[PDB]
């Protein structure tokens, strides 16, 4: 039967639950305590659930072709609840106006020409540019051999407006990173591996050409959360029990709480990664340190049923250098059809890398913002029914070229200053729920190896 020994795991976000979850299964003699520092389970993932609507807070969907949630999701009884996106029409917001997203390109990367150039988002002679770079590429071009940031790899053959006004707010999306200091290896190796194919990027886009491409659940991303706390058969969870300190007793760990500590022979972290740098004193993690994040309000307007619809599609991404608060906004109802029946539902995101102060600032002050926004995008006075707001306090770390290797490197340090401690969750192995289930599963699976 059991085993003397105790696995605790920190932090109850989806990789905290996810860990605890596939825990029980690899080491059934194994005792599981999860402390969560909160009043809840779930981390970033919340739904707002009244009034018949289902409007997520955090994430609102997942990647499909990261089936490991999938199979998760299905293992826990809730594959009758899978729904996907729509896809309609998205658009670009610049200082120029609302402009649709052009037709005639994969990942913004021109593969039909003449559909292509139809587009107002570029000038004619952008254009024209855009044309001569795809149909003629330098022969001074090298495929790159060791990785580069997206930017970098882009820009000479892409020219610089068209990476600018349209390939880093599409890629980017609600996470604003930098085109700039983003992988290419890590994020769009099909960009690089078709190239190589094809003999030119034009080309190699064009090998590529071809109901969304995400899933949510029909009961709300909460359900997930809550779904898996059900499943537990034998881990003990705490909520309201910070984790304070790590010390070190003897081969084991004491963990310091509120209320007396918890003895451990393996830690798993998913907490925020300046937390960890700051529990694991004896270990030397200047990667965690230079890690930047920074922090993401959601602010959601509900309308009684519109005649005129506010935007016309699924929703737009914003332009950084154009006059406004908010990075994107989606028509919810539009993309999903469970979330909001008989209404007009617009959630807008406010944040961006060395750009976020609004969501420091108070409700009315986010929420004067992102109206006056609204008001100007879509011609008129908008009068909310209700707001629901949300803050993601330093939710996206910015992974640049490097990351993986240099957080191996943490690992290994981590493991020889405190042998029995791991890590996992979005600083790490990607930053999307199916990223932080993997992360969970490798690390506890890496675990088993370890007894
Ligand atoms: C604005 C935004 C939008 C996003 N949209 C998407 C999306 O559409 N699709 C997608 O796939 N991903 C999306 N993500 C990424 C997604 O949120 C992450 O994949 C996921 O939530 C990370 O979960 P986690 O458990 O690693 O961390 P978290 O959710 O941050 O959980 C950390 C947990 O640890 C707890 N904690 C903190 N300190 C302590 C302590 N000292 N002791 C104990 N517990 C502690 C916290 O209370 C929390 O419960 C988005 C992220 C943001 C910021």
């Not at 059991?2 to 596939?22: D, E, P, Q």
């Not at 990261?66 to 200082?95: C, M, P, W, Y």
């Not at 500590?261 to 972290?269: N, Q, S």
Request: charged share 25%.
């Amino acid at each position: 039967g059991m085993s003397s020994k105790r696995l605790v795991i920190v932090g109850g976000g989806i990789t905290g639950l996810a860990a605890a979850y596939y825990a029980e299964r690899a080491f059934p003699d194994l005792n599981i305590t999860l402390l969560e520092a909160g009043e809840r389970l779930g981390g970033k993932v919340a739904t707002y659930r009244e009034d018949g609507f289902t409007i997520e807070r955090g994430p609102d969907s997942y990647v499909a072709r990261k089936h490991i949630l999938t199979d998760l999701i299905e293992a826990i009884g809730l594959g009758e609840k899978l729904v996907r996106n729509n896809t309609s029409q998205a658009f670009i917001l610049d200082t120029g106006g609302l402009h649709p997203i052009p037709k005639g390109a994969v990942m913004g990367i021109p593969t039909d020409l003449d559909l292509f150039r139809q587009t107002t988002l570029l000038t004619e002679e952008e254009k024209q540019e855009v044309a001569d770079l795809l149909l003629h590429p330098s022969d001074s071009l090298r495929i790159p051999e060791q990785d580069i940031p997206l930017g970098e790899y882009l820009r000479p053959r892409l020219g610089d407006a068209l990476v600018e006004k349209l390939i880093e707010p599409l890629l980017s999306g609600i996470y604003a990173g930098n085109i700039d200091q983003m992988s290419t290896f890590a994020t769009y190796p099909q960009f690089v591996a078709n190239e190589q194919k094809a003999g030119s990027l034009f080309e190699g886009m064009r090998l590529m050409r071809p109901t969304g491409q995400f899933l949510s659940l029909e009961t709300g991303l909460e359900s997930l959360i809550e779904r898996l706390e059900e499943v537990l058969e034998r881990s003990e969870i705490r909520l309201e029990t910070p984790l304070l300190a790590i010390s070190r007793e003897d081969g084991r760990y004491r963990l310091k709480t509120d209320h007396g500590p918890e003895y451990a022979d393996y830690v798993l972290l998913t907490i925020p990664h300046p937390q960890v740098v700051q529990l694991l004193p004896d270990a030397h993690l200047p990667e965690l340190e230079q890690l930047t994040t920074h922090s993401t309000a959601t602010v959601t307007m509900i309308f009684d049923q519109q005649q005129s619809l506010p935007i016309e599609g699924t929703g737009f991404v914003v332009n950084r250098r154009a006059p406004y608060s908010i990075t994107a906004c989606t028509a919810i109802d539009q993309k999903w059809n469970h979330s909001a029946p008989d209404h007009t539902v617009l959630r807008a995101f406010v944040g961006r890398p060395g750009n976020d102060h609004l969501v420091h600032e108070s409700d009315e002050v986010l929420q004067q913002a992102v109206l006056q926004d609204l008001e100007k995008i879509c011609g008129r006075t908008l009068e909310p029914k209700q707001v629901i707001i949300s803050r993601l306090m330093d939710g996206l770390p910015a992974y640049t070229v490097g990351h993986a290797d240099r957080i191996q490197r943490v690992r290994e340090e981590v493991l020889a200053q405190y042998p029995g401690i791991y890590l996992a969750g979005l600083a790490y192995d990607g930053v999307g729920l199916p990223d932080c289930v993997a992360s969970a599963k490798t690390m506890i699976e890496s675990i088993e190896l370890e007894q």
